[PDB]
Amino acid sequence: NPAIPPVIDLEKIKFDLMTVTKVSLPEGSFKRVKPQYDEIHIPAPSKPVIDYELKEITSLPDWCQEAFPSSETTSLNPIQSKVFHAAFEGDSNMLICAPTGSGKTNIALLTVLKALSHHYNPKTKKLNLSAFKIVYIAPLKALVQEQVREFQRRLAFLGIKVAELTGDSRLSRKQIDETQVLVSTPEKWDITTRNSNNLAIVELVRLLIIDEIHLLHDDRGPVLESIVARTFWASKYGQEYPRIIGLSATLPNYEDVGRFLRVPKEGLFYFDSSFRPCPLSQQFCGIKERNSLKKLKAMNDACYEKVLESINEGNQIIVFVHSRKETSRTATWLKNKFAEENITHKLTKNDAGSKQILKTEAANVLDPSLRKLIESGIGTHHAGLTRSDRSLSEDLFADGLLQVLVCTATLAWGVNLPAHTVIIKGTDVYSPEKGSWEQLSPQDVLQMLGRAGRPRYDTFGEGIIITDQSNVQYYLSVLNQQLPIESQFVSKLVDNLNAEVVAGNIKCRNDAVNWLAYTYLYVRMLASPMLYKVPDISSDGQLKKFRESLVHSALCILKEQELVLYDAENDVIEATDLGNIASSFYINHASMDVYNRELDEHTTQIDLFRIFSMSEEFKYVSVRYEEKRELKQLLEKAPIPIREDIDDPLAKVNVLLQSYFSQLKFEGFALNSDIVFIHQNAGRLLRAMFEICLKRGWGHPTRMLLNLCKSATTKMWPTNCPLRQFKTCPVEVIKRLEASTVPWGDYLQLETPAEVGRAIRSEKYGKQVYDLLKRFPKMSVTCNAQPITRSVMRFNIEIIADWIWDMNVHGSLEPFLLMLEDTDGDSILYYDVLFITPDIVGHEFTLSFTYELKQHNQNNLPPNFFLTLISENWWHSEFEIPVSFNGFKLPKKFPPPTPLLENISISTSELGNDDFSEVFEFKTFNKIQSQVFESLYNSNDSVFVGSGKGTGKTAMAELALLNHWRQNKGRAVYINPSGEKIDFLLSDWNKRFSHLAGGKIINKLGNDPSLNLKLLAKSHVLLATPVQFELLSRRWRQRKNIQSLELMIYDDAHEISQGVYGAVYETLISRMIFIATQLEKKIRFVCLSNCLANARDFGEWAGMTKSNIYNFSPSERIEPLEINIQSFKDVEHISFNFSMLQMAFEASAAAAGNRNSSSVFLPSRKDCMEVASAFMKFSKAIEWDMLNVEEEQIVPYIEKLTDGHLRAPLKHGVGILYKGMASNDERIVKRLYEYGAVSVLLISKDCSAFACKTDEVIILGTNLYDGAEHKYMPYTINELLEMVGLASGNDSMAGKVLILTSHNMKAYYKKFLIEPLPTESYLQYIIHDTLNNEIANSIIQSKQDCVDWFTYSYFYRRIHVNPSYYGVRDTSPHGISVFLSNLVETCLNDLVESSFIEIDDTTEIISTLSNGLIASHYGVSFFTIQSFVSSLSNTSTLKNMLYVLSTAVEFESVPLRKGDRALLVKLSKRLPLRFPEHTSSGSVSFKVFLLLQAYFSRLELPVDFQNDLKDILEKVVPLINVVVDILSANGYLNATTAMDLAQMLIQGVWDVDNPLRQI
Amino acid sequence: SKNEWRKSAIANTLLYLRLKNIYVSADDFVEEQNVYVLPKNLLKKFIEISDVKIQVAAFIYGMSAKDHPKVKEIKTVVLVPQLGHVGSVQISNIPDIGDLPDTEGLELLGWIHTQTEELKFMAASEVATHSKLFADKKRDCIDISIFSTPGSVSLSAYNLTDEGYQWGEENKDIMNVLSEGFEPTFSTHAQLLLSDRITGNFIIPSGNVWNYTFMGTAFNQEGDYNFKYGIPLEFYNEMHRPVHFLQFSELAGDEELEAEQIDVFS
Amino acid sequence: KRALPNIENDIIKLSDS
């Protein structure tokens, strides 16, 4: 392994002429010399002998008869009948070499039809769609579009679709599934497979047809080599390989291409020129005239004479030429040449009968030269002509009026217009890539000569090539089958290598050597070691050490240019973020080297145009003498300065890109070809430059480069009017707006249509303009800063997209670039790509993120940052707004946590009882327990504890209970947010305790609050939630069992920050302290939080001493723990990707490989099922199936299992856990994991409280979809700490954790896993509920008591230390006390307006009203009852009551998953009632409305929806009673309808006039 | 018949290099007299957006610190519509920015601008433009002149005496003759400190265009413009000179192209 | 100019004491 290969030069190994071989011509060939040009004639081959029978259309299977039309085809082709018994019967690979004719559509159809028949089922009507799909590769768009239209008509009866892949910005992902058979170019398919996110749908591809595989010889050959290599180098993902079908020209190295495609000896065909449908006689007019004037004359005289001979024989002619302009000259030169001798007697054969059809058609054409020619003779066909004139010229040629027809390259691919004779007049063609006039390529010549010979009418065909004498030997070898198909993979070695490194397939030199094995280069190096510069074939043998050297040399280039990291000694490879840009956007490695160095932070617009021109794609571009004169005007009169002089090549690319944006027309065909090359490459090259500057954080280059990306697509500058982008817009309006210097922002805010018409001059063209202004995208941005720590700063944004969505102009996806920029604008702090869709526009939507300030900004804050939101597509749709820090008070750096006294240990013997010792199981308390023990157990002081999960925090609560019981104090209470944990503790405490002096009798409470008050009197100890006890303790003045309490244990006291339920928990803690202070009773408070940042404000609030506050660091643990956080780019707005899924499996396999069980956490149940099926795969490829006991043990457990889904996953060894589910399934799956029978355990996010515990844990994705907001919200810190806490450490080595997350969330999680997140209050949101409640119970008499009420809360503590967090502008103590007073004044005015309270002057008295009394009693929100009173009426029916109930604010906790709206719409038409007319379907109210009817109708709901129904039924009893009380308080019989609804909820049935159903 | 602006825009590219060499005068630190603290980030951007030859100017606002009352921290630079010249500039009126947020108690400290010549005093056009703005409004304003020559910049704050306001009132326009008793003594040497701990921001016009050299007659010196917080544009930016972009728009439609010429990537 | 690695990896340890 330490042996480094030699750094060989890759430039030496490249091909960089014909070596006087002399092409072996066939028999019957002869020569005829003339002074102007020589001739080499070859006659056509003879038709072969009938040694076989052609297979009939009717003899094929009956189901695929209509695929081949019986009238058209009749029978199969001569070559197709030979390959039928290999292609159709056999599913193996094949390569078919043949002349340019045949039936490539029909040969492909045989392989396609057999691929369909695998998933076909005669029992069903049609074949199975989603199981598979097909791919077809083809050189150019013209040939791709032809094969799409053919395959649509051919496979019309099946109902299968076909569509061209176009490489959109992730837009056509809905169609790709619906299509079933894709067609694309090599470059598109290479980019598609190169992006590793698309590898989910690559396994569905099981047929890759590659048309014109002989393209391997061309510059674009390595693209095909990479595609085939990527196919076979991807077997670890899925076991099933795809079928590969090759189609080639009759050339050498055809056996080598077969071995490259894995084609066996069965289907390795090679039909020589004899088997062509219409035999082709060759001819080569080698021009002797070396002078330029006489050369062009010789080509014309050579063309004329062969045109004359074919008309004498009586045959139609096609005359290919190099350009559009030569097409007109060649036609008119022949007209002038004929005018001497024959004139128009030879052409346009007949008068009267034939000419009348020609005369009437001649008037149809629009062009001047086209009309002049067609009347006399000789046609014309090129891209410059309109679509009608092309169709006119094609149809009349088939009729046979015009004999000659001068064409361009476009006629060869896609058009299909056959003729007997064909002439390639001049083989010169301009290559703007290499920047010079090259000779015509082999694939172009073969396609042109494919038009020769009509199969039906003509017996034989003819093909002529007019070219220079030196080029005759080149084009001889093309047609005569002696032009070797070589590999050009060394030129694209570095690019294709980096692509696979980015994908994650090459992590070392050994991986790349195995990857190179499946290229066409590898086969040709073995075949011809002399050719490919191989040092010694005998020494190396199988080219292992050569590939070691080739890879190392390529990797050293990638190392220096910084596309990959590469330690050669230890031998490990890793892709850089710069390399990821090169891979995805398809850039050359040399261009990225230029972009990385040149792009400074100070890169001006003038530099950006230069840096674009320095790309490797424009390496061979240069200026010519004929071009300089026209470029002189363009260069000096350009908008943006060009530093480079006219002689510099960089000036040519610079000015032409600017010309493309300005839409400058010019005559020069050389320059007009070059400008086409520049703008095509410009789309992806400028996008690469944009992505580099965005990563590095250079704001000024990034914003400028975004406009250059717009200019590439839109063909316009920023100074040009944005109304240019609209398709159907008046030209007179756009013309006039650019003249008048008016700012463009003024036209947006015009509300009425009358203002537009007068403002834009033309009133007639207006009104339409008013509509288009409302179609234009604009956004109202409002941002607010919020400091959490000194360094960390949260940025809350609300956005209102304001435009009417037209599907034509926008599509269905308008992306926006969000950026948080620093005060200057030069540095980018945070960025994210928003994606706007039709549904979200018009409605407001929130958005939040965090950024950590630097040392400069922490000490002295800046005045403001800037928040920008630029549209990617639309011009002048950017909206900068200042995020102010004016008068912001940062909270000081958190003090050091309570340091554990290392040498303070405590044992179980130090308890004062023998029965107390037996309960704990363990005989010595851990270091954290030993610290708290003395104050916790012996002393009766109120005490805080701040410790991480898995440190005996449950036992700390139990210590307080043991001291309580020995003293015989009386009644005690335990609080916990998690209802799952209460159920565990109840059963555990009833067993382990509940036999210690008396009996104890512990209880749980429940949903019904009347029964809970009985359970209070019944019990010594209670377990409950914050919501349960807070509601029970409201009327504490009357209820003497509340005030008589001695002990309160608040477990998970950190959760007071967690939303509304946290604010309820805060209110509970505040109430018992108010009772203890007011009634002068010493009630003990044992808070058991997790590790907080600072517990000084918490302990002082809770009524605790400075001594009894033990807030430890997260660093201190009973066992060691090591966390790993993996980021991935472009994974913010989805759950998780394939790279995360693979790294999760590899980490799980690595954990299992070391004899340790491992758990995995996922967003939901549906994710666990798909990951389970993925984990059944992957482990199939690697030799690691099942493991842990034999199959005989697991079978009896699975057979008696409840759920049907869990049979297949649990068999292969992967258990699943989700919320709800059977207690049988939970018991079986958990015990199988604990025994060590099943290896892997997938867990839902919902079951984090279910303490399974394990050696290693994996957080696969830190995102969950929220249906209300329609956003993938991130995991909170407390949610991660729950999952991290399960990672129990082993005796041998510490317990591991793997957090697979996005880029932005790593900075948040890494910070707030080490440092505790500051525990802030959430009291301000429920201030209406709390004040109204305390007013209702006669605690708050006057509004002075509201100010006094705050002093008992945690909100009042934390607002003083961190005022800027709660939106306090004036951070001075005066401004804080003013903000508290205005919070009351605003809140009381809201209550009095909605008839909750009334205030009477002559200090005041604040008596409660009906709505306030109802809210305080049932524990329902102020905002809910406000809506209920407004919505309900004297004639609100049962339907109205069910809708009004569903709109309650208490149901915001009910989750809306992805695709629930689709299920609810299908479920609604089963249910009886209807949702109201003008209300949103995608809403939480919609889900609650229907699920309650399914509960009444008793429908078999799925596992997700029935769990949502249980959460709905928990809140439903108080809300229905609110509706009854609102109606009866006003005084309606209508209230009895709500009573009928109350009955329906408790029994779960409609009023069906049948009492027996409820039994 | 000349296209001479192109060389200046190219020369403006290297204005960040001039910020390597920054010079301050600092003659004698008088405790009783006032001192003015200029943020370095404002000096960075203001030199970057300015022109190498043509003079660029802008107003400045700020307020006193908590420690000392006479220590005037410059909080904001305010670019306004202007017509630049060589060693001279037609500046707009004192802009109303009371409607914008976070502008409570912004004392109008004076104005800041570039300069071609190096001096120990305010020039003829400099004193005239000072008196034209700050005579009626506030006499005790300052003038931070910036001598920006190749590879360096030199800062020097000045305070115009009551004798200067008379001379500026008398001599108005481009030049009421060459001079009428011009003096170096008119401007008093004021103190200036360049701090890089405190940070400042930019306020710009609502339309974004502040340079009206290529705009022409659109420059209204008496007009009341709207303003906003934002990142300022450079002198020869796309938006300041829309005439060069509207030379040959052409009105060209789409083109089909050949079968080989069509883009493979699509 | 130093280019950062793709797929960023932040290992974290809790050594205690």
Write the DSSP assignment of A1185-1203 as a string of letters: -S-SS-HHHHHHHHHT-S-
* A206/A111 Cα distance (integer angstroms): 11
The answer to whether A413 touches A142, Cβ cutoff 8 Å, is yes
* Closest-CA distance of chain B to residue A864, Å: 7
* B54/A452 Cα distance (integer angstroms): 70
The answer to whether A613 touches A595, Cβ cutoff 8 Å, is no
Neighbours of chain C (3+ CB pairs under 8 A): A
Q: Which residue has the tokens 């204005």?
A: B15
* A369/A406 Cα distance (integer angstroms): 13
At position A639, the amino acid (one-letter code) is P
Please state the separation of Cα A415 from the chain's center in Å.
38
- Token code pair at residue A445: 């010549």
* A674/A660 Cα distance (integer angstroms): 11
* B83/B87 Cα distance (integer angstroms): 12
* A809/A1087 Cα distance (integer angstroms): 60
Please state the separation of Cα A1376 from the chain's center in Å.
45
Q: Which residue has the tokens 């099922």?
A: A1169
Q: Where would I find the beta strands (DSSP E) of A1401-1549?
A: 1405-1408
Write the DSSP assignment of A822-855 as a string of letters: -SSSSBEEEEEEEEE-TTTTTSEEEEEEEEEPPH
Instruction: Give all domains of chain A, ordered by start, each with its CATH number.
Output: 28-48+277-485 (3.40.50.300), 49-276 (3.40.50.300), 486-575 (1.10.10.10), 576-717 (1.10.3380.10), 718-775 (1.10.150.20), 776-888 (2.60.40.150), 889-1117 (3.40.50.300), 1118-1320 (3.40.50.300), 1321-1408 (1.10.10.10), 1409-1551 (1.10.3380.10)
Main-chain dihedrals φ then ψ at residue A850, nearest 5 degrees: -130, 145
Q: Among all residues of chain A, which has the CA nearest to that of C9? A: A1126
The answer to whether A983 touches A971, Cβ cutoff 8 Å, is no
At position A804, the amino acid (one-letter code) is I
Please state the separation of Cα A214 from the chain's center in Å.
35
Rg (CA), chain C: 13
Of C4, C12, C15, the CB nearest to A1125: C12
**For residue B86, what is the enclosing H or E element?**
none
Count CB neighbours of A1114 within 10 A. Answer: 22
Coil/strand/helix, residue A749: coil
Angular region, A879: left φ>0, alpha ψ -120 to 50, beta rest: beta
Question: After which residues does chain A show a gap where C to N exceeds 2.5 Å?
Answer: 16, 1402
CA distances from A1491 to A981, A1040, A1494, A1501, B14 (A): 27, 40, 5, 9, 68
At position A1129, the amino acid (one-letter code) is K
The answer to whether B240 touches B233, Cβ cutoff 8 Å, is yes
Q: Which residue, A1118, A1102, A1082, is CA-closest to A939?
A: A1082
According to the annotation, is A1301 in a ligand binding site?
no
Report the C-alpha dihedral over residues A1153, A1158, A1160, A1166, rounded to 10 degrees: 80
The answer to whether B106 touches B74, Cβ cutoff 8 Å, is no
* Helix, strand, coil % in chain C, rounded to nearest 5: 0, 40, 60
Q: Which residue, A904, A43, A1052, A1019, is CA-closest to A463?
A: A43
* A303/A964 Cα distance (integer angstroms): 113
Write the DSSP assignment of A1003-1018 as a string of letters: B---S-HHHHHHHHHH
* A450/A454 Cα distance (integer angstroms): 10
* Closest-CA distance of chain A to residue C14, Å: 5
Q: Which residues of B touch A142 (CB under 8 A)?
A: 259, 262
Q: CB distance C6–A575 less than 8 Å? A: yes
CA distances from A1241 to A167, A195, A983, A1152, A1238 (A): 39, 30, 23, 11, 8
- Token code pair at residue A1505: 């929806």
For A1508-1515, which contacts have Cβ atoms below 8 Å and span 24 or more sequence positions?
A1508/A1454, A1508/A1455, A1510/A1220, A1511/A1453, A1511/A1454, A1512/A1451, A1512/A1454, A1512/A1488, A1513/A1545, A1514/A1007, A1515/A1448, A1515/A1450, A1515/A1451
Q: Which residue, A1040, A1015, A944, A1029, is CA-closest to A1354?
A: A944
- Token code pair at residue A940: 């009766």
The answer to whether A1225 touches A1206, Cβ cutoff 8 Å, is yes
Write the DSSP assignment of A977-1006 as a string of letters: S-HHHHHHHHHHHHHHSS-SSS----B---
Please state the separation of Cα A571 from the chain's center in Å.
32
The answer to whether A720 touches A738, Cβ cutoff 8 Å, is yes
Coil/strand/helix, residue B41: helix
At position A421, the amino acid (one-letter code) is T
- Token code pair at residue B62: 């700020």
* A1450/A1337 Cα distance (integer angstroms): 23
Chains C and B touch (3+ CB pairs under 8 A): no
Of C10, C13, C15, the CB nearest to A1125: C10
Q: Which residue, A154, A159, A148, A181, is CA-closest to A67?
A: A154
What kind of experiment solved this structure?
Answer: X-ray
Main-chain dihedrals φ then ψ at residue A753, nearest 5 degrees: -70, -25
* A233/A199 Cα distance (integer angstroms): 12
* A1123/A1284 Cα distance (integer angstroms): 8
According to DSSP H, which parts of A568-648 are helical? Answer: 577-584, 589-598, 605-613, 625-636
* A244/A176 Cα distance (integer angstroms): 20
Report the residue count for chain B: 266
Please state the separation of Cα A357 from the chain's center in Å.
58
* B165/B172 Cα distance (integer angstroms): 11
Q: Among all residues of chain A, which has the CA nearest to that of B249? A: A662
According to the annotation, is A453 in a ligand binding site?
no
* B214/A694 Cα distance (integer angstroms): 32
* B231/B202 Cα distance (integer angstroms): 6
According to the annotation, is A102 in a ligand binding site?
yes
Angle at A807 between CA A806 and CA A813, to 5 degrees: 105
The answer to whether B36 touches B109, Cβ cutoff 8 Å, is yes
Report the C-alpha dihedral over residues A80, A84, A90, A92, rounded to 10 degrees: -10
At position A299, the amino acid (one-letter code) is M
Q: Which residue, A23, A485, A76, A26, is CA-closest to A279?
A: A26
* A1528/A842 Cα distance (integer angstroms): 39
The answer to whether A1313 touches A1123, Cβ cutoff 8 Å, is yes
The answer to whether A94 touches A254, Cβ cutoff 8 Å, is no
According to DSSP, residue A55 is labeled: P
**For residue A303, what is the enclosing H or E element?**
helix A292-313
* A1335/A673 Cα distance (integer angstroms): 82
Looking at 3.40.140.10, 3.40.190.80, 3.40.50.2020, 3.40.50.10860, the CATH number of the domain B1-266 comes to 3.40.140.10
Q: Which residues of A touch B265 (CB under 8 A)?
A: 167, 185, 187-188, 191, 586, 680, 683-684
The answer to whether A10 touches A557, Cβ cutoff 8 Å, is yes
* Closest-CA distance of chain C to residue A6, Å: 26
Q: Among all residues of chain C, which has the CA nearest to that of A1309? A: C10
User: What is the rounded end-to-end Cα distance, in angstroms, of chain B?
Assistant: 44
* A802/A779 Cα distance (integer angstroms): 6
At position A954, the amino acid (one-letter code) is T
According to DSSP, residue A419 is labeled: B
Q: Does B75 touch chain A (CB under 8 A)?
A: yes
- Burial of residue A1032 (CB within 10 Å: 0-12, 13-18, 19+) is buried
* A1028/A1045 Cα distance (integer angstroms): 16
* B260/A383 Cα distance (integer angstroms): 11
Please state the separation of Cα A1425 from the chain's center in Å.
42
Q: Which residue, A1067, A1066, A1013, A1019, is CA-closest to A1047?
A: A1019
The answer to whether A1328 touches A1390, Cβ cutoff 8 Å, is yes
Count CB neighbours of C15 within 10 A. Answer: 8
**For residue A389, what is the enclosing H or E element?**
helix A387-399
**For residue A89, what is the enclosing H or E element?**
none
Q: CB distance A1124–C1 less than 8 Å? A: no
At position A1066, the amino acid (one-letter code) is E
Report the C-alpha dihedral over residues A1535, A1541, A1545, A1551, rounded to 10 degrees: 140
Q: Which residues of B touch A391 (CB under 8 A)?
A: none
The answer to whether A1117 touches C14, Cβ cutoff 8 Å, is yes
Main-chain dihedrals φ then ψ at residue A815, nearest 5 degrees: -80, 145
Q: Among all residues of chain B, which has the CA nearest to that of A138? A: B264
Strand A1295-1300 relative to strand A1121-1126: parallel, antiparallel, unpaired?
A: parallel
- Token code pair at residue A76: 């199969």
Main-chain dihedrals φ then ψ at residue A500, nearest 5 degrees: -75, -30
Helices (H), strands (E): how many in chain A?
59, 42
Q: CB distance B245–A643 less than 8 Å? A: no
CA dihedral for A253, A256, A260, A263, sign (positive or negative): positive
The answer to whether B48 touches B236, Cβ cutoff 8 Å, is no
- Cβ within 8 Å of A, B 133-162: none
Q: Does B177 touch chain A (CB under 8 A)?
A: no
Q: CB distance B262–A684 less than 8 Å? A: no
Write the DSSP assignment of A599-616 as a string of letters: --TT--HHHHHHHHHTSG
The answer to whether A372 touches A347, Cβ cutoff 8 Å, is no
The answer to whether A693 touches A587, Cβ cutoff 8 Å, is no
Task: Name the resolution in angstroms.
Answer: 3.4
- Token code pair at residue A586: 């398809």
Angular region, B29: left φ>0, alpha ψ -120 to 50, beta rest: beta
Buried b (16+ CB within 10 A) or exposed e, A1367-1399: ebeebeeeebeebbeebbeebbebbeebebbee
